[PDB]
Amino acid sequence: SETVVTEVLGHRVTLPCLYSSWSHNSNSMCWGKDQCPYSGCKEALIRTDGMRVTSRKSAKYRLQGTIPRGDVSLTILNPSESDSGVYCCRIEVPGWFNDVKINVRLNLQRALV
């Protein structure tokens, strides 16, 4: 299946990503467009440590949830058409070959009707 969030152009929108096992001493994350960023979370849209956002590509991207409890959902401010598409949430997990990758598609419309 695919999880799609539908929103009207220009309206802030939140794409869910929750990791309930989150431990601030162990986990961190990043979001990417189209596919997940590579391990290390470079070229990411937005990136955290175990507690808070540590870098982002622009102020369009915010994490408004409680990051130390694993709510690393992405909020996109004033989305325009180019912002539509697949977003991938990568959770960095201790060890090798253990990272979690969660995909959400953003669909933007002019109306909900």
Task: Summarize the topology.
Elements: E1 4-8, E2 13-15, E3 28-33, E4 46-48, E5 53-56, E6 61-62, E7 74-76, E8 85-92, E9 100-109
Parallel strand pairs: 1-9
Antiparallel strand pairs: 2-7, 3-4, 3-8, 4-5, 6-7, 8-9
Provide a descriptive summary of the structure in words.
By secondary structure, the chain is mainly beta. The chain has one domain (1-113): Immunoglobulin-like, CATH 2.60.40. It contains no helices and nine strands. It has strands at residues 4-8, 13-15, 28-33, 46-48, 53-56, 61-62, 74-76, 85-92, 100-109. The strands form two sheets. A six-stranded mixed β-sheet has the order 1-9-8-3-4-5, with no helix packed on it. It has a three-stranded antiparallel β-sheet with strand order 2-7-6, with no helix packed on it. It starts with a strand and ends with a strand.
Report how far the terminal alpha carbons are from each other.
25 Å
Determine and state the CATH class.
Mainly Beta
What fold name goes in the CATH topology slot? Immunoglobulin-like
Query: Helix content range of the residues, please?
Result: under 10%
Strand order of the largest sheet: 1-9-8-3-4-5
Order of helices and strands: EEEEEEEEE
Strand count: 9
Largest beta sheet, briefly? 6 strands, mixed
**CATH architecture title:** Sandwich
Outline type = globular
Number of domains: 1
What is the percentage of strand-forming residues? 35-45%
Per CATH, the superfamily is Immunoglobulins
CA-atom Rg in angstroms: 14 Å
Instruction: Give the class from helix and strand content and strand pairing.
Output: mainly beta
